[PDB]
Task: inverse folding
């Protein structure tokens, strides 16, 4: 579930104002992921001033502060090994002509 | 709600042709966000020639004119501090060997 958040999922209906109407079990059957811990009031116990900025920090980091970082580290690589990749490709160009 | 618009939410059902069928209260209970201001005709009062290009300007800026800007400012940093980061990493490489 945090893996799908990198392509955009953002805790779709577990992070507040989404009650126990569906998606959850309380038991362990069926294969739905089990419910939020509850109380005598049958209220969701998670504080929601913590889980909501936790997701928003994670959705900031891995979707923006991380992927967009990967472009810069990709962008330096094409800046640096480009004049070397021509010699490397011309080197392996021999083996592909050698094959016949 | 504008924070989720950076990862793609785009005012899902408040920006027109989505009436008071659900999601809203008129009162202050329950925890649903309260309704659009209405009229004697019970029509949504917001002009919708203003709120729709306001979101589309915001969705243009923070999702494209802003994040893609961050890649360029990331891309200049890996272009500039790369030859300095080698000396910095080789410098802190001493303390990690010093630890034993
Ligand atoms: C710096 C920027 C770029 C990051 C944006 C951070 C927000 C996405 C986070 C930080 C604090 C969060 C709020 C902190 C706690 C509240 C109360 C919370 O409801 C309660 O806990 C009820 C408590 C009570 O009022 O008695 C619901 C979420 C909410 C509005 C959060 C909404 C989203 C917020 C604004
Ligand atoms: C320059 C490009 C890249 C930005 C694209 C801008 C559009 C996303 C915006 C600018 C003007 C907008 C329109 C301006 C006002 C109308 C009428 C509005 O309906 C009414 O207000 C009824 C008024 C009436 O006809 O009596 C509904 C949205 C709509 C179609 C908007 C649809 C989206 C639009 C085209």
Result:
């Amino acid at each position: 579930e945090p893996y799908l958040a990198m392509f955009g999922q953002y805790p779709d209906d577990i992070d507040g104002t989404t009650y126990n109407f569906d998606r959850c079990t309380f038991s362990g059957n069926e294969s739905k992921p089990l419910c939020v811990e509850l109380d005598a009031n049958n209220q969701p116990r998670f504080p929601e001033w913590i889980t909501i900025p936790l997701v928003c920090i994670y959705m900031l980091s891995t979707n923006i502060l991380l992927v967009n970082l990967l472009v810069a580290m990709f962008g330096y690589t094409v800046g640096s090994v480009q004049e070397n990749n021509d010699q490397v490709w011309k080197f392996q160009r021999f083996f592909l002509v050698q094959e016949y």
